[PDB]
Structures are given as structure tokens and as C-alpha cells.
Amino acid sequence: AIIKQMSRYLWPKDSWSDKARVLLALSLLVGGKVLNVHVPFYFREIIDRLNIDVAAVGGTVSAVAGAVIFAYGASRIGAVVSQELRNAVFSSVAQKAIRRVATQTFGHLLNLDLSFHLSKQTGGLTRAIDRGTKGISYLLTSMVFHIVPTALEIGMVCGILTYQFGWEFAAITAATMAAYTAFTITTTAWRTKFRRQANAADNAASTVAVDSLINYEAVKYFNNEAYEIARYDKALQAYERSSIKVATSLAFLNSGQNIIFSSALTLMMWLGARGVLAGDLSVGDLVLINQLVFQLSVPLNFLGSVYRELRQSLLDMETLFDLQKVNVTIREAPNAKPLALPKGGEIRFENVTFGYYPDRPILRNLSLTIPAGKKVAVVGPSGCGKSTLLRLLFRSYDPQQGKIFIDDQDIKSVTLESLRKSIGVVPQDTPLFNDTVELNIRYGNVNATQEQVIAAAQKAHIHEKIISWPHGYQTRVGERGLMISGGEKQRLAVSRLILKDPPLLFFDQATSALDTHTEQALMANINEVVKEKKRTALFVAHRLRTIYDADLIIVLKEGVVVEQGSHRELMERDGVYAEL
Template sequence: MLLLRCSIKQAWPLFSKSNTSLARRSASPLANTLRLGYRPTPIRTFTKTAQLLHGPSDANRTPAKINIPKEAAATTAQSQKAKSDSSSYSLFGRKVSTSELFMMRSLFKTIWPKDNPRFKIRVLIAVSLLIGSKLLNVEVPFLFKQIIDQMNVNWTQEVGVLSTVIGSLILAYGGARFGAVLFGELRNAIFASVAQTAIKRVASNTFNRLLNMDLQFHLSQQTGGLTRAIDRGTKGISYVLTAMVFHIIPITFEISIVCGILSYNYGLPFAAMTFCTMLAYSIFTIKTTAWRTKFRRQANNADNQAASVALDSLINYESVKIFNNEAFQSSKYNNALTKYQNASVKVATSLAYLNAGQNFIFTSALTAMMYMGCQGVVSGGLTVGDLVLINQLVFQLSVPLNFLGSVYRELKQSLLDMENLFQLQSVPIKITDVEGAPQLQLNASTPGEIKFENVTFGYHPDRPILKNVSFTIPAGQKVAVVGPSGSGKSTILRLVFRFYDVDSGRILIDGQDITKVSLESLRKKIGVVPQETPLFNDTIIENIRYGDLNSTDEQIHQVVSLVQLDNLIKDLPDGENTIVGERGMMISGGEKQRLAIARLLLKNAPITFFDEATSALDTHTEQALLKTIRTIFKRDNRTNVSIAHRLRTIADADKIIVLNKGHIQEQGSHAQLLSDPESLYAQLWNIQENLDVEEQLRLEEEERLRKEEQQLGQRDK
């Protein structure tokens, strides 16, 4: 009996240990944001490029219609009700549902790839070690029982034999315990590469999908929330894989073995008690966890919101300072943190309720089974060793039961964390190649004729930007597109580059429909200089090299000289290796535009678009740079399309297209359009000329007053 009390004393900590979360504590939103916010990511750059190229506000646009996979529609009635009550099921404003079954099937494909037999062998070895570990784990109580029964004899007879038998059993007991632990650790080591490879594959596929999403998708997202969801989702994948392979399967296997042993050796009462305990425990855990799920979703939603607010505030640091709105941004961030705090408190309190209920169920079952075992010993039906065996099996069962509860909770949380990640997999990529799309082939002599044929397009169905527009941009010429704001000038660039597809009509380049040729070949033939240049947080030379990743340093130095950046680089302490800062904040707007033009020249594309590409330059630098570009393009016979508000910069264009309210109002050369004083172009030109004259007079008057003040000062002296 002394040994029995000792065994109970040793096993009690396993039962009384708090049923806490399996080391998946989320970092604070601020910590996650600081980690994400200052890391230059292609996602952010891609999004900002889209924003810079986008003219009208995207606020009034209709989100893209999303086709949900058939598996994703198979959700339960309970989850459907939760979806109607919580916006956290939406993909950052888009209603997208992804079933848990769909996510689990997708994950299974990552750990059981058809084309990687070595990967499958690793999984099979890990599962074999798992089974061996559990079999040894169940064997331990039997060895303990035999030790107790062997010691409950008359020690005055055959002491040597008894000592040998008991010693062998003790060695076997220790070996079984060590073997169970060793097999478990070997399993973890072998499966580690499987889990990490799966995480890498999913994260890489998600990132590639984001880069291939259409422009409208990126403009409608909050980058901070998007990156936070991806970060949280990849961590969720790691836990789900571990839980399924190392917890759910082994727990089920171990419980089945224990139930079979109790039923076979000690009759139905013990097996029935065990079954009822597991049933009650599982039902309580699942029901309570389903109730707690909404709190976890609220916490995730608040976490995304806090990350987005903080990231936007840090990225737009100058705007916050310029408008003195630090208090407003702090209040906004604090409100998001308050929502996260309230949701997290609900998560913690509901967890305490779940733990208490689980322990009550198990304690009740344990008490009943120990009472039944003691009755069996008193009646002589069971030995002391049998009582110890029952005690050990029940306590051994408590460990997987406790893990079952925590694993189920964490599994549900991880699936929620993965929700946005897999929702991204359900959003269709709208701009894609047709099957077998050929390369875009330009004419050898005069490449780059662009033709719009009855093109209609709008970002919103109720607000068309271009209305049945037809025009031709001749190959090898400089063509300007002008007009009032919102007339659709920048939209032409986005349609030619296939950021969007037209609603009706078609666009041809050298007689080829751009929707019928490969995207890669189309975009390779087009160079763009946006009004504001998005830069990576890298050196000047690497930002220029982004125009052609295979370019040499000598080629880069040539374009740097052409755009007159060489003097700037010489004055910098680190020269061309100077870091430009986040979004190029450490250099001026004019320097960024020259860097963008250098990228364009390095790309050497036969078709080029300039979207207010020199608006930040002073007049002297602008004219010198335009002269250089004009010379290069005429020499290489490139097609140059300039989108401009300042008409002086495009007065030398071979053709000027005037857009107004979605229509081509007029087109022709500068002289032809000015010959009609009633033309819109002539009106815009006269307004700008008058403004230029007034500005010149104002500057001359300021200069005259300055000289008079200097003369008066000299007289006073």
C-alpha cells in the first residue's frame, strides 16, 4: 500500500498541472507591427505602385466578385450564424468563407505531395515512431503492476530468484519509459523538416499569389492587416500540422488501447466509465470551444486593425507631423488596442471556465474508478498490482485527455488564424494569360503602334471612365494625352499595361490583342515612369538596377549620367551605395523622378509611358532632361506616350489627344489644336500661359522689391 500511495503521489502532478495553451502566445500588436512596419516588402511596394498609378479614388468602387470553391461552401449552420454576426469572416471587407475541411485537405496535400517520395518516407517514419512511442507508453503501467505483484510475496523463500525477476522488470520499466521518450523525440526531429517545408510552400504560394492579384484587389486592402494575417496564418500552419500528426492521431490511438485493455482485463464497468468520461469530456470541450471561437475571431480582427493603424501611422509619419495629428493617431491606435484587450480578456476568462469544467469531469471519473478498484481489491477480485495498473492507466489517460482539450482549442484557434491565409487562395486572379498565349511580337522597323477600338471601361459599373473610345498612337512617335482631372488619362496607361481589362472593345499593339498575348511579354515591352516613384529601402544603384536586374554597373552609370544624377551621387557620403530610406524618403521628389527615368532608360522598352514624370523638377533640369529623352527616343524610334497637365512639356508632341468626360474631344498637333480658339486644348493652353505670365510678373516684382530693400540698407549704413 505504501508503494500505491507513492505511485499516486508521483502521478498527481500530471493531473493537477494547469491545462494551459501549448506555447502559442501571440505577441502584442505593437511588437508585431514594429517588426513588420520597417521591413521593405515587395507586397507593400507593389501596392504603393498601384496606388501611385491610380488616379480616381477607389473608395467608390465595387469589390471584385469572388468565386468560392465548392469545398469552402460546406460550412455548418453554427458557423454560418457566427458569420452573420461577425465581420471577421470577411477578407478585409470581402465576404469570403473557407471551410475547415478545405483548409485541412489543402494542408494534407503539402505534407503528402504526389511528386516527392522522399518526403512521404519521412512522414511514414515519423508515424511509425509515433506508434512505437505510444505502445511503449502503454506498456509502462503493466510493468509497474508486475513489479508490485512480484513484491507482494513471501520474501523468505527464493530471494535470489525474486530479486532477479524484480530487477529485470525494473530495468524493463526504465527501458520502456526511456524508449517512449526517445521515439517521441526522434519523431519530432524527423518531422521538423516536413512541417517547415510545408510552411515554406504555403507562404511562398501565398506571396506569389499576392503579386499576381489584380490592381483593384491591392488598392482595396490594408497592407498592415494583410501582412499580419499572413504572419499569423503561417504560424497557425505549423501548429495544425504538429497537432494533427503528433496529438490527434496518437491521442485517439492511445485512448483506444486503454479502453480495450480495461474492457478485456477488468470488465465492462471500467470500460463503460472510461467511455462515458471521454464522451462527456469531448462534448464539453467541443461545445465550449465553439462558444469561445467568436472571442478569438474578435481578437484576431482587432489585432489586424491595430496593426494596420500603427503601420499606416508609421509609414505616413511626415503627414502625421505636418498636420500635428499625433494625438488623433494615438487615440485611433488606442481604440484598436482596447478592442483587442476586451476580446483577449474574454478569451482568457472563457479558457478558465473550460479548464475548470474539464477537470471536474475527469476528477469525478477518477474518483468513481478508484472506488470501483478498491472494492475489487477488498473482494479479492483484484490484486494491489491491478489497482496500481488501473490507477496508472487512468492517470496516463488524463494526459492525452488534457492534451485533447488544449489541442482542440489551439487547433480551432490555428484554423481561425489560417482563415485569411486560405481565403487568399480562394480569391481568383482576374488578370491572367489565355491558354497557350503567344509572345507579343513587335514590328521590326516601326514597333509599338497602340490602337484603342471602341473601348469602354469603368472602375465602377455606374461610373464609366472611358466611353466607346477609339484612337491610334502611331509607332515611333511622341503622343501626349491631356485633359481635365478625372477624364481618364492615367486609365489609358493602366489598360495598356493590363492592370485592368476593358469592359468592351479591345486594345491592339502592332495588330495583336493584348488580352491574347502573354502578360510577361506585354509588360516587358512597356516602360513606365509614374508621377511619384516608389522606391525600395535599398541603395541608389540597386533601385536603378530594378529596371533591368541583369544590367551591369557600367550600363547603370551611363543612364545615371543621362538623367544628371551623377553630381548628386558624387555629393553623397556613400555615393551610389547610399540607402534611399523607406519609400525613398531620404532623397527629394525631383531626384526620385530622375531615378525613375534612369530605371526606364535601363529597361530599354520600345513603348514608354510618362505620367507627369517631370512635375517635381525645376524648369532648367526639366528642359535639359526632356531634351535628352527626346534625342534618345528619336534615335531608337521608340513610342513615347506622355500624360501631362503642364502643356509646355508636351508642345513638341507629334500628336496630342484631348480627353474630356470619357470621350476623345479632339486630337492633332500643338499647332493644329491652337488654330481653333474654341478648342478645349486652346482654352487650357491660354489659361496656363496666363498663369505663367502672372507667375513671371510676380517673381519679377519680388525681385525688384528685394533689390530696393538692399539699396535702402546700404544707404542706411
């Protein structure tokens, strides 16, 4: 379809070295097929040069037929060496084209919006990429490894047999290849029915056996040894009844394939003998006809798979190129400006309205003011709508109505990358790349050296815990590493923040850890690291007891700012710490 040229005119044809490799693959393709059709011709020449009155004229090989004897083996060797070098070069070409496709698709996935990523499965996108690149690999491989050389060799052989002998030899060769392909496609489609029935019956036998060994106590309490042997025996008999159909249909497939080529090769020597006995041909030309058509019968192994897999591959390929058609909803405005970072960072929510499932809002005409360089908190019940305060300022979502200003300039007007540089956030559930702790600290600023990592873990007070780990700072952590508690991960995220050094700070739900002592330690550490650098630091907390010491605390009853004040004047509200 469009997908064919969308790949085949973009990815293999881009730079001169890769174009040279594509041309090398094609030249090896054509040279291999030329040498392939020269093997029977040189065998014809051997047969016809020694077919002399031996006792009278010919004296020695290497004067009678040595050159064509060497050229036969050389064409034979070169015909396969060109195939294998064509495959080895186009495997490289296909792999680099696929790497370009995969890394471009992956970059496009990374600049998509948060809404897209949250409405897809974790492995749905990655398996889409993987199946798409294996589909591109199969398509490009099956064209150049199998289908183009085979169609080309049928063309060469029908052309040779029409040039030398007559169009009926080419007609029989073309009819033979059409019949062989039709037979193989049809029969291989029917055989899959039989193979699936065999797998079903095999799994039934195995499930009878395993279900009888699991419930072995019940088997022997009720005396059903012979009954379970009988059930296993019947399930195995049903398996062998289907394995017969698999084996018999395989016999039918292979027998029919060689019946087709053997009928062709016998009809063509009857026709070649009609021409030898008419004086037209020689007895070497019978060998030429025989070996040309036989060499067509060799590369045809692929024909069973091809019709299913190519079709599937285009399906798998389509979705991959669908992932590059999704548009990003978060649009950087034209002529953006990286600005408001030297100015004191103040965050002004002007009548913002936002909520997932836009008929159900979360924030209702919300307006608030975060002063420059101050310690501000938002407080409220869990699920009251404070968790989105991040996702609006970070511009991972747009407010459906209203505006958000960083220092009297709108966040939809600045460069998105400038804003995302500006904000540094401590997430509720700190994620772990399954890599070293040293790199997990580095992730805040990947250009930071080892000593900067060490200083950042000092200021977040992690160094003692990473030294106490066995391997040191190389301690592998994550899903397949040393599991660490929530306080250690929260310190890990605080250190990432320390290393990024952003002007604006968030601490969205960093107190989600259970233990109060560790969150007090976390609160202390973030209190020093916020202090004395003019870092405008917002905290989203579900416990105002932990965040009472903020310079300004605002409270949030379902999408509206209610009041603004201090510790004691806001613990007139409920959720008090008296029950703790």
C-alpha cells in the first residue's frame, strides 16, 4: 500500500554509504542469479566438448574441456557466495533502516502528551514498536532474500529457454512455477488447521497428566489409578490421531511439490528429445534444460510462510507508522521566549478550570498567588483536587479555562522546554530505572560528574546509606536490584532535585510514606535545602501537621481557594493530629 513506499523510499535511501550498500546488495543479487543460470550452461559445454570422436581428435582435459570444467565450479561457488553476501549486506541495510525507524518512533513517543501515555498499556507501545520493526525486517528481508531473486530467476530462465529452445519451454517453466506456488500456498494454509488441532490435543494430554499428578491424594483415596491412566491413554490416543493428520498432510505437501517439478522435468526432456532427434539440440542441451528448471526448484522453501507472514507484517508495520501520526495536543506557541527565571518566581493561577473527563471538572475557577521565593503549601482532603496543581504548572495539561502566569507571563507563551527546565519536582511515587544508584542520582543532571553526585547525596543525606550498601555507589537498584524503603527513594528524589538546581520547586505528596519519623527527617532535609537560596517551593501534602511550618498555607475545598494563613489559625479545621 502506501506503507510500502513510505518505508522503501525513505529509510534505505538516505546517505551515500547506505545507498552504496543497497546498490551492493542489488548488484550481488543480479550477479548471483547470472552465475546461477551460467552453471547449467557450462555443464552443457562440458557435455558437448567431450562429446567428440574421442579416439580420433581429443587428447587431454585442460585442452579439451578444462576451462569450462573450472568455470562450472566457479559459477557454482560464486552463485552461492553472491547469495550469501547479498544476504549479509542487506541484513545490514535493513538493520540500519530499522534502527532509524525505531529510534525516530521512540523519540516521537517521548514527546507525546501525558494524556496519551496514561491511556495506553505499559508494554502496548513497546510491543507495537517491536512488532513493527520485526514486520519491517520481515518485509525487507523476504523481498530481497527470497521474492525478488526468485521472480528474477524465473524471468532469466524463461528468457533463456525462449531464446535458445522455444516459447513452449518457457511456458512449461512458467506454468510449473505458478502451479507449484498455488499448490504450496493452498496446502500450507490447510495444514495449519491440522497443526493447531495437534497442539490442542497435545495440551489436553498434558493437562490430564498434570491434573492427575496434582490431585494425587484424591487419585489414590478413591482408587482411581486405572481410571486416570485410562483418561491419559485416551487423551494420548486423541493426540496421535491428530499427529497422523499433521504427518500425512506434510507427506502430501512434499509429495505434491516434487510431483509438480518431476512432471515438468519429464515433459521438458520429452520435448528436448523431440528436438535432439530433429537435429536442433544436442545432448548437452537436455542437461541445460534439466538443470535450469531444477535450479528454480531450489530457493522455493519460503513459499509456505510468505502469504501469512507478509500479510501479518503489514499489519504489524501499519501500527508502527500509526504511532508517528498521533499529533501532540500541547503545542508550543510560535516565537516563544525563555524568560522569567532571573525574575523572582511567582505563580499566579487566574480563574483556572481543569479536570479529567472534561464534563467532570476538578478545579473550579481557581485563582491563587504563590509569592516569589517563599515556602507555600496547599492543604486539603485526599482527592480534593490538589494533585493536578503540578500537571498544570508543568504544562503537561492545558487549563480548559483560565491562565497560569509565572512572573506575569503566561505559561502557554514561553518555550515548553524552558518551563520544564525551570520546574523541579519530587514525585509521590519515585520511579526507579533498573540501573545503578549512582545513575539514579545522576538522572537529575546527566552531565554532572561523580563528585557532584556525591555532594548532592551529601546534602540529601544519602551517602551513609549508599556506603552501607555492599557494592557502594554502583549498587544495582530497581525492579531487579536491592529494594530500598520509601524514605531512601524519597531521599533519592530529593537528591535528584538537588542536582538539577531548579528555580521553582514542587514536593507533591512526598509524605506518602507510612512512618512519621522518616517523613519528619525528610521534612527537615527539604527544609534546609529549600532554605536560603530563594527557591519558590510549593508543597502538596495531605497532612497539614507535617507542613504547618510553610510560610503561606492555602487550603483547597474542591477547586476553590478558601482561606490563606498560618499554623494555629488553620488547625481550627478537621483532620487534626489529635487522633495521631
